[PDB]
Amino acid sequence: ASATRLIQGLRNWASGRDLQAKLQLRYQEISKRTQPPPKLPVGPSHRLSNNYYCARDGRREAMPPSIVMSSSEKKAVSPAPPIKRWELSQDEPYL
Amino acid sequence: TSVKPIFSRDMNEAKRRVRELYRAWYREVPNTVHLFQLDISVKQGRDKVREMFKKNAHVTDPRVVDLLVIKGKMELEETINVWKQRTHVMRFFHETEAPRPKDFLSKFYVGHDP
Amino acid sequence: TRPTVRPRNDVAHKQLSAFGEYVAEILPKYVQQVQVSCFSELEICIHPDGVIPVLTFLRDHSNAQFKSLADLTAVDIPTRQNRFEIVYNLLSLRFNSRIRVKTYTDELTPVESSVSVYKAANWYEREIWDMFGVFFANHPDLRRILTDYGFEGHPFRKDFPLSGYVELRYDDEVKRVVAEPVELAQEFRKFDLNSPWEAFPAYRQPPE
Amino acid sequence: KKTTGLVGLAVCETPHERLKILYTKILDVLGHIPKNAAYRKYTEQITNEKLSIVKAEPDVKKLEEQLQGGQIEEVILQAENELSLARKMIQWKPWEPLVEEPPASQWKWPI
Amino acid sequence: TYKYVNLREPSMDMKSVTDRAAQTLLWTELIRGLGMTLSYLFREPATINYPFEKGPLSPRFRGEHALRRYPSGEERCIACKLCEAVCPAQAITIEAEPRADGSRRTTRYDIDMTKCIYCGFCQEACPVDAIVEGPNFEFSTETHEELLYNKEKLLNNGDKWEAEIAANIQADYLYR
Amino acid sequence: YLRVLFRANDVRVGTLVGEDKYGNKYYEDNKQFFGRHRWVIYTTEMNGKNTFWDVDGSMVPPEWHRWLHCMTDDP
Amino acid sequence: TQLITVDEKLDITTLTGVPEEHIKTRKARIFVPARNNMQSGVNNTKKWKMEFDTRERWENPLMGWASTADPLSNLVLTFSTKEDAIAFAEKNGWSYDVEERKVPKPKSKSYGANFSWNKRTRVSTK
Amino acid sequence: LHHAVIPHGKGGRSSVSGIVATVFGATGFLGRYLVNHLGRMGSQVIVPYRCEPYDTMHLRPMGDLGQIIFMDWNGRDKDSIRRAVEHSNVVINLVGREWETKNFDFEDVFVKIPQAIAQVSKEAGVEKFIHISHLNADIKSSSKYLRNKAVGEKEVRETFPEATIIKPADIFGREDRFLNYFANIRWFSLGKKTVKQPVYIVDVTKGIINAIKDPDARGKTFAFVGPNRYLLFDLVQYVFAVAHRPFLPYWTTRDKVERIHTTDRTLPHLPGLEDLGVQATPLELKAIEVLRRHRTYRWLSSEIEDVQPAK
Amino acid sequence: GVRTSPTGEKVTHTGQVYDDEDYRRVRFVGRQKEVNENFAIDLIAEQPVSQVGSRVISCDGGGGALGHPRVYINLDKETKTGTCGYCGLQFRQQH
Amino acid sequence: HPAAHGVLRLVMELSGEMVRKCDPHIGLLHRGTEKLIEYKTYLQALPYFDRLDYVSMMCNEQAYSLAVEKLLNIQPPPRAQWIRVLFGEITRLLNHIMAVTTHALDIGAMTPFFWMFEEREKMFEFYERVSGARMHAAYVRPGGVHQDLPLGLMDDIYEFSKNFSLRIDELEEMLTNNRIWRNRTVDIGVVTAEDALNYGFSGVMLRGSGIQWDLRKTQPYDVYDQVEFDVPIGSRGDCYDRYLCRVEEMRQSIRIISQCLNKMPPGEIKVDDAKVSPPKRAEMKTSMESLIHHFKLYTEGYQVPPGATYTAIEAPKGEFGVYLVSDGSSRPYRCKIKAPGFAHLAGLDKMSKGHMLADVVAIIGTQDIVFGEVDR
Ligand SMILES: NC(=O)C1=CN([C@@H]2O[C@H](COP(=O)(O)OP(=O)(O)OC[C@H]3O[C@@H](n4cnc5c(N)ncnc54)[C@H](OP(=O)(O)O)[C@@H]3O)[C@@H](O)[C@H]2O)C=CC1
Ligand code: SF4
Ligand code: SF4
Ligand SMILES: [Zn+2]
């Protein structure tokens, strides 16, 4: 912006990237500071009459660790389903 | 309470190991005091070595004697290497006093303390 | 319920339940506790004589691959007859799974140095040697990592205080750095932050 | 083929027959194991079931498909590792009773 | 979903192999690299000019550790020690006495600018917004003694500007 | 011109936004980028330091200090 | 593997490397902290605290701060039993004193005992 | 006494000692090691400097957080010295330049300085004023230097009579003056028979800090002599033998050569090192300390290659 | 309004002023003992004590969360002008 | 030394410019974070996880807050989740571009340093306008994002997205078929897959050699089910190809930012529970319960159920592990950090078996070791 056009031609002749259009010298793109202030919404809370904390008590639903052994068999289980093999890309994979 | 051992089955191999480590620390001191370019006579160094061995005189458990031997052999690894510095080997010496007394009287004038 | 509360899973819960009972069935010599939390990560609690058998079984056997390793920090706990907890954290590659192997130990009895079965275990084992002092028999290399050389005392124990005993400064009397006993310029005011009135009712141990 | 997907790994020209003789040696070394350990039961069950997956598949890519744990040579290396633990598990007799007690009040957390 | 790299091969056509040879000889795309660098050469640079053209900031920035007061009023702090109770390196030393009326106050309110770490937790914890982060960041002290602020240093620091801090909080009170 | 010549680098007078007690001047350009919007010109002998040379930060009054760090758009 | 085992207690007081002044002179106290009196509720019971003694804390001449020549006064150790407290004190080496866990004495009370005919317990105001 | 002068706790790194020191000089050698032992001792050290602030930055990290403090002074005013000793427990007079400038002779330094500071110190109500000086101060000739220090001792015993005048003999240390003068002989040596008895600097300042913390120190002048008492030619043999530089024996005033060829005599009229109760260390190991500069990689590392007798 | 100290120096708003045997006087060499002229006692007294003819009033100090939280104070006694704990100022009632 | 990226003692016991042994003596940056977090509470010891890593300033915070919330059974509302995803990708972008930059400094290559640090100055401007921090935004409390993003910020993110896509195409223009940089680094740091497993490497290494593993695509620790991307895989290994994997993770991070700006719902900031996060200001001034929860929450810290838990995120290094052990308390009993930088430091011997010292420099610089995190 506001540079002589022959040196801009030497810029885009030095590298074919169209250096003028996206040049990373941002002039006035950032909006005006001290904006209109926001009225912050509040989500699923202080809706009256059913905000019993016993319902959404994630602190009092921690459970102690359940135990198995201490100090005709369709079995030999794995810890998980065997994980499905992935799939190639779409937008220009190789190949 | 049969604890699994470290190296030995009684204290005799522990005595053998600690005297072998003392042999090694005897022959390794003048190499260091020639190598780190210190300012200390050799006999002063050897005598503080045997003082640091005599500091732990009351130790009787075999695992613990083995673990002291492992500590001393690790530091002799660090002094056959030059991985340590001049500061650490002078820090084994106690030369910047610290002249802190042992009498009751001087600990009374400089007090709030037994 | 639906908002603000993390919805627990059941598929991985039942699967790790069955898998823990599977391991408990197939190695009865070295199983003491199998346990599952509410968020379903497996814990297997182990006497320290079958550490190498359990690890050689868990890296292999093809019912559970478990290639990848994470640290074993023996979290420093008094009041127990055997103090420390070696905590393996195994992370598989074919299964997307997380198991933990808590074997126990104490201050002098060595454990069998898992470096020979996991090459990753070497610097973690040297770290736990330098910071706690659990000596590792049948091990190639035990140096001290992440401390000073001339320092000792194994500072992560509960017995070692928050600030150290030694303190380094410079002096021109011997033109070098020397060590001194510690002198703090401010007390570090500890805060009593332990509320009464039974913060969680489910976790009451049976009283004496 | 060409371009196996891993670095320090390259398939041989005969996957099938190497895989079969691997699993028959697994059945052998497992046959030396005593009967009462259910370890033998689980290993023999899953190994013969995986062999039976292999038996009816003269297609390389289809055997990669139906058998879980792809692609091909990871199964081979994993079976080699299973032979290594079987050779270790001649020793260590992991169906014996427990070694001696914990301190009986240990694994309670909240201390 | 995955997109792996260097699935490529040297194509065996003659124009392909002679272009790879010409790139082997003249270092042609090396000259392309030179051209890219010259394209950033004739680009206008983006610096500031420090004593004259300062760099930008944000309305929520964390500065000074100053103190406010009421409209023609008392010191806004009431010695409730929440700032020390959230202070992570304990750089808030508070010793309190009530004054000669019955109203409650302080004696000693020291912030260790060394030991501070500029969380903002003492901004978020102060119940009346009495301690506020300033805007400016220019301390730059030739001694170690003169980065330990006492109470009157803090209040003379907070009386060096308030309209500043009033503007930043007034433009920022709804957010936090 | 000698003053602005040996000041640092600029000749870009032509906006002339404001001035303040202590006498100092504040300019704001539109044409440059994000980083050369606004600048200051320090007057001399504001506390008699021969402050033509060796200028400090925080010679600015605080209201223009908020203005010059680009927190608002207006003086 | 079937070693010495015999009545020889543990001696880590040369392993752990704490200096001898802090080994010998420090007299620890093992006790149960009672309820914080101005509060109520005894959830802060059930934990055997080991504390050390207290030593000098002087006026920092530059700030009036609390500066001490103590490394150890910030310690507190939470135990569960009394036996293991005694065991840890003997194992690590330093001196120690013991105090009991003085329970409340359970009394019998009644609102129907507040109200009576010929017993003098009578609040006369409820 | 005012509070917060009372001692507190284990000494070292902000333990408030019972002393607030005011040290004249301290930019050079002896005052620097004295400030070093006071900062280890943990006092509050007022020090004036009349010089560039780089040497006062040099002695900055010696004391603890804010325990030292600096000011400016001269040999020409009275307000600065009075402001120095406004609030001073103890005050020591170290001053003296080895060579005359074009403004300050060896006359009027030891006349204008100690009279002025002694007078304003006695009028300021200090305790335990300690003035240093040299041994073998004679009223007679052959040393402008030593006769001016003799007149200095006369003035400081004249006014404020319960002071403490301390003389050592010549001192050798980690940055010694005279052995570092024996450095310069290497590029060129003079040998005569004269006895000499050096003393190492850190036990000198140990005796100084014991005598500055302990009363009975006032009035009685003290003399600090090491245990050596040997000959000049043996010292020259010893230093060129420790340095391993080959030699053939035959910033400098002639007052320097008059000092090192005067004499060194004894005085049993006054106590010394161990009568005050401080250890004295011999020459040889500190010589191995201080001769590391001159060797240059030929016989750079050696300890016990040479012993030289006393007398 | 600062007072007069005996040492030719300034007092502070809290009476911690020096003595004639002090070392911090000689750490005040050539540099300002800083002090604020603004005193908290000497501004509150120069406020008009407001009069609100109700019984129990609110206090915020002005502005929404730009001041201290709500406090409801009593205005029954006439022997004492009713004082907010946060606002630092007094009140009365009329009738 | 500057090629010793950060501070790193390296005892190399070589044969002359063609080695014999390398010894990574680390520990010089040892600080005591684990001891300090024993003696504090959760909300207070959060900036130790700000300051543990010192490039990925937000993802490790995400890891710690996810450890606490996976312990505590709380799901934050989804606007906080999408903002957490957004800053995860932005900070991952910053970390990968510094990895490319400091490897360029080690290898020579003085200019992409300056270019991409102008871009990273724009990044720090974003952190300035978000949290009032230049480099260490706490900003991620257990309870989610605190003090949400202000008005007129998504404009800046959008403009940065477009310009940065152009700038990273220009970095591929600059390097990447540069003959001298390519043939400088081809066949160094070969890592077989067996060794890549058993040496405990994680993340960028395991992508960069062989195995097809991804923490994001295989374990949703966030709202990553709805976003669509693809992770690059290295297949030679050949450290050049690992570099290419880092470049394509950067451009895929731009894609995830594009989807995230498409799918931002205007829900909320914090959770619906004043016994976990402190309430806002109007409630803090009026409501009694808000004041009580505020005051007791900033004194004691909230009580926490007991548990020995672990989680891990996809750090720009890799499998970043955090292992909490929590007493029934408001204090963590022992936290622990598994650093992928430490794991990658472990295999330095096998990376430098048969090479020369410039290869040692390129191998230390080619994996994003930082040693503020490698130390624990
Ligand atoms: N054996 C003995 O008893 C001997 C003792 N000494 C004493 O040892 C101490 C250390 O020796 P040395 O290093 O040479 O001495 P000093 O470093 O103490 O030199 C005197 C100090 O006072 C300052 N000073 C000197 N002349 C003037 C003046 N005209 N006006 C103002 N300030 C002045 C100097 O300032 P600056 O350097 O900053 O310019 C210097 O810091 C001295 O006190 C000296 O008297 C010395 C020789 C023999
Ligand atoms: S939080 Fe605010 S009101 Fe409370 S003591 Fe601190 S500064 Fe004072
Ligand atoms: S910002 Fe500074 S003073 Fe405030 S709480 Fe944090 S460390 Fe403490
Ligand atoms: Zn009010």
mmCIF file with all atom_site columns, all heavy atoms in Angstrom, chain H residues 219-230:
data_model
loop_
_atom_site.group_PDB
_atom_site.id
_atom_site.type_symbol
_atom_site.label_atom_id
_atom_site.label_alt_id
_atom_site.label_comp_id
_atom_site.label_asym_id
_atom_site.label_entity_id
_atom_site.label_seq_id
_atom_site.pdbx_PDB_ins_code
_atom_site.Cartn_x
_atom_site.Cartn_y
_atom_site.Cartn_z
_atom_site.occupancy
_atom_site.B_iso_or_equiv
_atom_site.pdbx_formal_charge
_atom_site.auth_seq_id
_atom_site.auth_comp_id
_atom_site.auth_asym_id
_atom_site.auth_atom_id
_atom_site.pdbx_PDB_model_num
ATOM 1  N N   . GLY H 1 219 ? 42.405 1.597   74.536 1.00 0.00 ? 219 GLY H N   1
ATOM 2  C CA  . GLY H 1 219 ? 43.637 1.968   75.190 1.00 0.00 ? 219 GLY H CA  1
ATOM 3  C C   . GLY H 1 219 ? 44.839 1.171   74.724 1.00 0.00 ? 219 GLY H C   1
ATOM 4  O O   . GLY H 1 219 ? 45.791 1.749   74.202 1.00 0.00 ? 219 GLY H O   1
ATOM 5  N N   . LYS H 1 220 ? 44.823 -0.145  74.904 1.00 0.00 ? 220 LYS H N   1
ATOM 6  C CA  . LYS H 1 220 ? 46.010 -0.942  74.635 1.00 0.00 ? 220 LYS H CA  1
ATOM 7  C C   . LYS H 1 220 ? 46.198 -1.142  73.142 1.00 0.00 ? 220 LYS H C   1
ATOM 8  O O   . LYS H 1 220 ? 45.392 -1.818  72.496 1.00 0.00 ? 220 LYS H O   1
ATOM 9  C CB  . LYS H 1 220 ? 45.933 -2.285  75.347 1.00 0.00 ? 220 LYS H CB  1
ATOM 10 C CG  . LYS H 1 220 ? 46.124 -2.160  76.839 1.00 0.00 ? 220 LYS H CG  1
ATOM 11 C CD  . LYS H 1 220 ? 46.297 -3.508  77.514 1.00 0.00 ? 220 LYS H CD  1
ATOM 12 C CE  . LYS H 1 220 ? 44.977 -4.233  77.661 1.00 0.00 ? 220 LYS H CE  1
ATOM 13 N NZ  . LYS H 1 220 ? 45.141 -5.473  78.461 1.00 0.00 ? 220 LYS H NZ  1
ATOM 14 N N   . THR H 1 221 ? 47.266 -0.564  72.600 1.00 0.00 ? 221 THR H N   1
ATOM 15 C CA  . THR H 1 221 ? 47.633 -0.809  71.215 1.00 0.00 ? 221 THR H CA  1
ATOM 16 C C   . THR H 1 221 ? 48.086 -2.255  71.039 1.00 0.00 ? 221 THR H C   1
ATOM 17 O O   . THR H 1 221 ? 48.606 -2.881  71.968 1.00 0.00 ? 221 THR H O   1
ATOM 18 C CB  . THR H 1 221 ? 48.724 0.169   70.767 1.00 0.00 ? 221 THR H CB  1
ATOM 19 O OG1 . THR H 1 221 ? 48.982 -0.017  69.373 1.00 0.00 ? 221 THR H OG1 1
ATOM 20 C CG2 . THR H 1 221 ? 50.013 -0.006  71.558 1.00 0.00 ? 221 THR H CG2 1
ATOM 21 N N   . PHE H 1 222 ? 47.827 -2.805  69.853 1.00 0.00 ? 222 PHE H N   1
ATOM 22 C CA  . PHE H 1 222 ? 48.083 -4.209  69.559 1.00 0.00 ? 222 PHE H CA  1
ATOM 23 C C   . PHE H 1 222 ? 49.012 -4.347  68.357 1.00 0.00 ? 222 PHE H C   1
ATOM 24 O O   . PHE H 1 222 ? 49.042 -3.490  67.469 1.00 0.00 ? 222 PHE H O   1
ATOM 25 C CB  . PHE H 1 222 ? 46.785 -4.979  69.280 1.00 0.00 ? 222 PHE H CB  1
ATOM 26 C CG  . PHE H 1 222 ? 45.956 -5.257  70.501 1.00 0.00 ? 222 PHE H CG  1
ATOM 27 C CD1 . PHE H 1 222 ? 44.637 -5.638  70.374 1.00 0.00 ? 222 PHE H CD1 1
ATOM 28 C CD2 . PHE H 1 222 ? 46.491 -5.159  71.768 1.00 0.00 ? 222 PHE H CD2 1
ATOM 29 C CE1 . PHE H 1 222 ? 43.865 -5.891  71.484 1.00 0.00 ? 222 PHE H CE1 1
ATOM 30 C CE2 . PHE H 1 222 ? 45.720 -5.405  72.885 1.00 0.00 ? 222 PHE H CE2 1
ATOM 31 C CZ  . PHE H 1 222 ? 44.408 -5.778  72.741 1.00 0.00 ? 222 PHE H CZ  1
ATOM 32 N N   . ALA H 1 223 ? 49.770 -5.443  68.344 1.00 0.00 ? 223 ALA H N   1
ATOM 33 C CA  . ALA H 1 223 ? 50.733 -5.736  67.294 1.00 0.00 ? 223 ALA H CA  1
ATOM 34 C C   . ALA H 1 223 ? 50.521 -7.148  66.764 1.00 0.00 ? 223 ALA H C   1
ATOM 35 O O   . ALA H 1 223 ? 50.535 -8.116  67.526 1.00 0.00 ? 223 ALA H O   1
ATOM 36 C CB  . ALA H 1 223 ? 52.166 -5.589  67.799 1.00 0.00 ? 223 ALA H CB  1
ATOM 37 N N   . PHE H 1 224 ? 50.365 -7.258  65.453 1.00 0.00 ? 224 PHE H N   1
ATOM 38 C CA  . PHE H 1 224 ? 49.996 -8.503  64.785 1.00 0.00 ? 224 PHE H CA  1
ATOM 39 C C   . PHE H 1 224 ? 51.147 -8.977  63.913 1.00 0.00 ? 224 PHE H C   1
ATOM 40 O O   . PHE H 1 224 ? 51.353 -8.478  62.806 1.00 0.00 ? 224 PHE H O   1
ATOM 41 C CB  . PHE H 1 224 ? 48.728 -8.312  63.973 1.00 0.00 ? 224 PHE H CB  1
ATOM 42 C CG  . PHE H 1 224 ? 47.483 -8.453  64.774 1.00 0.00 ? 224 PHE H CG  1
ATOM 43 C CD1 . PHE H 1 224 ? 46.964 -7.397  65.480 1.00 0.00 ? 224 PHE H CD1 1
ATOM 44 C CD2 . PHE H 1 224 ? 46.865 -9.675  64.860 1.00 0.00 ? 224 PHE H CD2 1
ATOM 45 C CE1 . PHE H 1 224 ? 45.818 -7.567  66.235 1.00 0.00 ? 224 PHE H CE1 1
ATOM 46 C CE2 . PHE H 1 224 ? 45.729 -9.853  65.595 1.00 0.00 ? 224 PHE H CE2 1
ATOM 47 C CZ  . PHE H 1 224 ? 45.198 -8.798  66.282 1.00 0.00 ? 224 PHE H CZ  1
ATOM 48 N N   . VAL H 1 225 ? 51.884 -9.962  64.411 1.00 0.00 ? 225 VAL H N   1
ATOM 49 C CA  . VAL H 1 225 ? 53.049 -10.507 63.731 1.00 0.00 ? 225 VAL H CA  1
ATOM 50 C C   . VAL H 1 225 ? 52.835 -12.002 63.555 1.00 0.00 ? 225 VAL H C   1
ATOM 51 O O   . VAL H 1 225 ? 52.485 -12.697 64.514 1.00 0.00 ? 225 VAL H O   1
ATOM 52 C CB  . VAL H 1 225 ? 54.331 -10.235 64.533 1.00 0.00 ? 225 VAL H CB  1
ATOM 53 C CG1 . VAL H 1 225 ? 55.496 -10.838 63.847 1.00 0.00 ? 225 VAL H CG1 1
ATOM 54 C CG2 . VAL H 1 225 ? 54.544 -8.741  64.738 1.00 0.00 ? 225 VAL H CG2 1
ATOM 55 N N   . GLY H 1 226 ? 53.062 -12.501 62.339 1.00 0.00 ? 226 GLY H N   1
ATOM 56 C CA  . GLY H 1 226 ? 53.009 -13.915 62.101 1.00 0.00 ? 226 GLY H CA  1
ATOM 57 C C   . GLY H 1 226 ? 54.171 -14.648 62.756 1.00 0.00 ? 226 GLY H C   1
ATOM 58 O O   . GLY H 1 226 ? 55.107 -14.041 63.288 1.00 0.00 ? 226 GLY H O   1
ATOM 59 N N   . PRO H 1 227 ? 54.124 -15.977 62.711 1.00 0.00 ? 227 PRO H N   1
ATOM 60 C CA  . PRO H 1 227 ? 55.131 -16.790 63.405 1.00 0.00 ? 227 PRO H CA  1
ATOM 61 C C   . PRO H 1 227 ? 56.434 -16.984 62.645 1.00 0.00 ? 227 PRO H C   1
ATOM 62 O O   . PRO H 1 227 ? 57.229 -17.837 63.043 1.00 0.00 ? 227 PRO H O   1
ATOM 63 C CB  . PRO H 1 227 ? 54.412 -18.134 63.546 1.00 0.00 ? 227 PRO H CB  1
ATOM 64 C CG  . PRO H 1 227 ? 53.586 -18.208 62.323 1.00 0.00 ? 227 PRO H CG  1
ATOM 65 C CD  . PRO H 1 227 ? 53.116 -16.812 62.041 1.00 0.00 ? 227 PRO H CD  1
ATOM 66 N N   . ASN H 1 228 ? 56.668 -16.242 61.568 1.00 0.00 ? 228 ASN H N   1
ATOM 67 C CA  . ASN H 1 228 ? 57.737 -16.614 60.644 1.00 0.00 ? 228 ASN H CA  1
ATOM 68 C C   . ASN H 1 228 ? 59.099 -16.067 61.063 1.00 0.00 ? 228 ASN H C   1
ATOM 69 O O   . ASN H 1 228 ? 59.976 -16.830 61.479 1.00 0.00 ? 228 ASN H O   1
ATOM 70 C CB  . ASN H 1 228 ? 57.354 -16.129 59.249 1.00 0.00 ? 228 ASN H CB  1
ATOM 71 C CG  . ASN H 1 228 ? 56.110 -16.796 58.739 1.00 0.00 ? 228 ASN H CG  1
ATOM 72 O OD1 . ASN H 1 228 ? 55.920 -17.998 58.916 1.00 0.00 ? 228 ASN H OD1 1
ATOM 73 N ND2 . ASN H 1 228 ? 55.231 -16.017 58.123 1.00 0.00 ? 228 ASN H ND2 1
ATOM 74 N N   . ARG H 1 229 ? 59.258 -14.741 61.008 1.00 0.00 ? 229 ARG H N   1
ATOM 75 C CA  . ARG H 1 229 ? 60.488 -14.005 61.333 1.00 0.00 ? 229 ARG H CA  1
ATOM 76 C C   . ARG H 1 229 ? 61.703 -14.572 60.587 1.00 0.00 ? 229 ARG H C   1
ATOM 77 O O   . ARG H 1 229 ? 62.563 -15.252 61.148 1.00 0.00 ? 229 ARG H O   1
ATOM 78 C CB  . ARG H 1 229 ? 60.696 -13.947 62.851 1.00 0.00 ? 229 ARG H CB  1
ATOM 79 C CG  . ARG H 1 229 ? 61.818 -13.012 63.304 1.00 0.00 ? 229 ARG H CG  1
ATOM 80 C CD  . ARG H 1 229 ? 61.760 -12.757 64.786 1.00 0.00 ? 229 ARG H CD  1
ATOM 81 N NE  . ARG H 1 229 ? 62.912 -11.992 65.237 1.00 0.00 ? 229 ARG H NE  1
ATOM 82 C CZ  . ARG H 1 229 ? 64.011 -12.551 65.732 1.00 0.00 ? 229 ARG H CZ  1
ATOM 83 N NH1 . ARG H 1 229 ? 64.085 -13.867 65.851 1.00 0.00 ? 229 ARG H NH1 1
ATOM 84 N NH2 . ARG H 1 229 ? 65.028 -11.799 66.129 1.00 0.00 ? 229 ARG H NH2 1
ATOM 85 N N   . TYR H 1 230 ? 61.710 -14.345 59.273 1.00 0.00 ? 230 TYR H N   1
ATOM 86 C CA  . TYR H 1 230 ? 62.855 -14.828 58.513 1.00 0.00 ? 230 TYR H CA  1
ATOM 87 C C   . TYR H 1 230 ? 63.452 -13.806 57.551 1.00 0.00 ? 230 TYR H C   1
ATOM 88 O O   . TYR H 1 230 ? 63.048 -12.645 57.527 1.00 0.00 ? 230 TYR H O   1
ATOM 89 C CB  . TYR H 1 230 ? 62.483 -16.094 57.758 1.00 0.00 ? 230 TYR H CB  1
ATOM 90 C CG  . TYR H 1 230 ? 61.410 -15.959 56.737 1.00 0.00 ? 230 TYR H CG  1
ATOM 91 C CD1 . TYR H 1 230 ? 61.719 -15.668 55.420 1.00 0.00 ? 230 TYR H CD1 1
ATOM 92 C CD2 . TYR H 1 230 ? 60.096 -16.188 57.071 1.00 0.00 ? 230 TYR H CD2 1
ATOM 93 C CE1 . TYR H 1 230 ? 60.751 -15.558 54.483 1.00 0.00 ? 230 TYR H CE1 1
ATOM 94 C CE2 . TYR H 1 230 ? 59.110 -16.085 56.136 1.00 0.00 ? 230 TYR H CE2 1
ATOM 95 C CZ  . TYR H 1 230 ? 59.449 -15.771 54.841 1.00 0.00 ? 230 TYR H CZ  1
ATOM 96 O OH  . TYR H 1 230 ? 58.490 -15.656 53.883 1.00 0.00 ? 230 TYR H OH  1
#
